[PDB]
């Protein structure tokens with residue numbers, strides 16, 4: 431967002447997390 | 452694995468990661 435936020439990758443799968451800048 | 456590794460969720464090209472303890 432620069433900030434690099436970490437968020438849950440909203441999906442049917444295994445506890446994925448993304449780095450949103 | 453304790454340690455917490457951020458492995459890669461190869462299930463997308465958006466930078467998702469998986470916590471591997």
Ligand SMILES: [Cl-]
Nearest residue numbers: 443444445446
């Ligand atoms: Cl997920």
Ligand SMILES: [Cl-]
Nearest residue numbers: 463465466467
């Ligand atoms: Cl991804």
Ligand code: NA
Nearest residue numbers: 463465466467
């Ligand atoms: Na992704």
